[PDB]
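new request in #modeling-help
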Amino acid sequence: MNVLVQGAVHALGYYEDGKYSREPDCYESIRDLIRYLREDGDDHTARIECGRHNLVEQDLVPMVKCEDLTDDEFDIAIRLMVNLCQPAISTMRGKPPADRDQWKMYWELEENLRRAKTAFSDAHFFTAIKKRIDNYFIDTEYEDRDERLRLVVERIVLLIKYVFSINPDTSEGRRTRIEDSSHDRVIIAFLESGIDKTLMHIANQPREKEFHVTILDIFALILKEQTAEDLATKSEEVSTAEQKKTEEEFRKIIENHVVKETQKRKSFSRFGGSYTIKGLKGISANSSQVVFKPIQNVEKHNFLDDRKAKKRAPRNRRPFEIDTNSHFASSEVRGMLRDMVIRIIETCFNRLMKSSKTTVFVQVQKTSQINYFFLIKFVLRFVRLSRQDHLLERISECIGVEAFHENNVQLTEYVENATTLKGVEAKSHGLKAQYALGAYNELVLLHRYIYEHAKEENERKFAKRALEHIVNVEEYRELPIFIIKKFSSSVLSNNFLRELVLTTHHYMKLVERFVKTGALKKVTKKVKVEEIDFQFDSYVCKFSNVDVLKWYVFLLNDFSKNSTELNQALVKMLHRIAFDLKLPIKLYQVSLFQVFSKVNEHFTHLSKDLRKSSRLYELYQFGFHLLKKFFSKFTGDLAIEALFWKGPRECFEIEN
Amino acid sequence: DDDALMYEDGDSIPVDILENIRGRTIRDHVSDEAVAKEIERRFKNFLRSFHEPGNKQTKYIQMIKSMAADNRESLEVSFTDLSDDNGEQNISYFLPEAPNEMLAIMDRAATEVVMNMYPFYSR
Amino acid sequence: RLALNERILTGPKGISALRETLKDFKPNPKDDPYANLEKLMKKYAYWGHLMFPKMKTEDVLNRVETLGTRRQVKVFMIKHRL
DNA sequence: GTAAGTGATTAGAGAATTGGAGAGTGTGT
DNA sequence: ACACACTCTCCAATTCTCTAATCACTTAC
């Protein structure tokens, strides 16, 4: 077999520095390569040999840059390039590698794709394909178009999608989090060619519907590595301020190093001995405790817990993150992307979303659902944070009550499939559920922003009716407890749980305001449907269940690296049960006292002024008040009751 | 379907293979079978046909004759003759970069040239 | 095999031994709550070290918090609260 | 509206599947 | 002889299903 591939591959041409030189029978060589790839088996021998020889970087992209290239040569080059740039799981027909030997072939396919990405860091390639796109759409009328050029244009568009869906590469080196990614260089070349304006022009046309889903996928994959907070703030700098700032940063680093080293070298002591702690019992009979280092005081003793190996969970039940390569890019890249986002909102968004929502959930392919929810979340957060209030007309496809309805339906289906299935399939459905939850959170926050800051009372009334519908109907009010009771770390990421906590925080603030203004007094409930009085304390009491409070104590362990918003949300939810329902017995628990011990140890290293200046002072103060309330009436049986989670009758009998 | 997009029913002086290799890491590509056969053909042609400039004699055929007269089994080739315009400059390029792979092919070619002029040399 | 379980948690090394350890502990309510917490936490560690020496204090308290859901431990607590 | 009966939900126990630790034994220096 | 690696066996955790008891809703006076 592969002698045929080796004969075809080296017969194309050779790249001089700055010029590719071609042999006359490139056309027949490329035909033979396509023929072999069509006839390749499950071993994928011809495909792996093409990946070994690096056809895309060495030959095909420099060939496409040539000016003398005729129509058929360009056409068949694009055909072969699309087939080689197909993703790996698509080559493996959707099945993930279930076996030790299948994973080897998957990895061998994946590395060849990761190597090829730096070929597309040149604007000349995008300039070359932009002319063919312009010929079909702009320079040819709808009556006079050719199906051959139609298929070529479809291949070019799918090639752009396949290029932007390539993963990052670790082998080239490790790069810091505060500089331009390798993805950004492809973005710079893509935007400098100006092909994005043609893509926006195509997306604006109602007649050209079949390209719209792919164009949505392309713009989502461009914005893959960014967050709305990076682009929302307008970029400006002065180098005087930058120099002063960097000098202060290294001043912090130097002082930290000197203090830490002097503390460590002052810790050591010279000689030894061995000592008995009279009053503490040993394991063996009639024995006192014995130590073999000069301890300062008896409370410094640790019972040699440093030796003992920690118990691990089994491999099916450990928490897992999902990693997006996320960085603070340069001011140049951020300015270009900000301009692109504003142009998309002005020219494409309403038509594109309206064309997409009829089709995205009907299709066989899974990934466009994730792209749909991602683009919704990004655009709405960008509008709200940038305060570009005149753009609110342009996103009117997403403001209705129907948006909340359709989002809730899709989120419910994803949660049920992710809970009931097993394995990588369950993780795959849970990944969809995560993006749906984030889009729901942005819907809530955007409607509150419109109701607070819009200038037109008609727009305020339209937002207010939607907010009242969300507060009133049971499906929206029962959703957080429904998801929290089904959470499991085997099939859902930590990012999902953080997102769920923040969503619950914002929703409960909305319900509290609509009760406080008196707008919520009576509530419909299913039986037939009947109306009953609503009480906010009765609603808050649902979250005091043990199956909810487990995860709040679980996420409070990461306090030293959480964001300030997440720390505020966790402390606020505990503070409500502590001092609004006024029920501290449910929070008296050893696994929370461990978190308080860690926080106290962290705060020992700071002076009395720096403690009040610190960002963790809210958590410190809450721990102070709860521990004082605990020790106000300490008893030994209460200290025994702290070891177990306490139910309702347990709380009543402990209290009374 | 992507198969229907990518495949079609139409899929149902000769080229110098060696000159397109000039920039690669040659160790990885002289193991390609189509390259080894081409090098093996051209080195036999070089041994049979090379003329020293200003001379009418096939130098390496004369050297093989004087080697066979003494029953020796190694043949000395000049890198200058390999790298001149009448030699094979692709072989002279490839040789210092992958000598373990290249010398084996040249040994095989030299053996096949000797065994036709002198069939008794297997003894 | 060997593992911490309900027999050990209800046995003579268990909850009754922890109660006997805690009989001498009497914190001052007017003092620093974090200091009182530190004093309590190391008595928990001392009881855990005597009760099951193989494992860390953190994992011992996690295992006790897990084993509180068993019916045998619940029946023990129902008798013990009297 | 109140009391009694019946239905539904929740709690416990038994059985089966999955995974990981520990100890024993064999081989190589 | 001593160290290191590999294989086998057992036990514990989880989830489903069936049975029994307690609580709440419906019906009748």
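bot summary: Chain A touches chain C at residues 280-281, 283, 299, 303, 305, 308, 310-311, 590-591, 593-594, 596-597, 600, 623-624, 627-628, 630-634, 636-637, 639-640, 643-645, 653 (CB under 8 Å).
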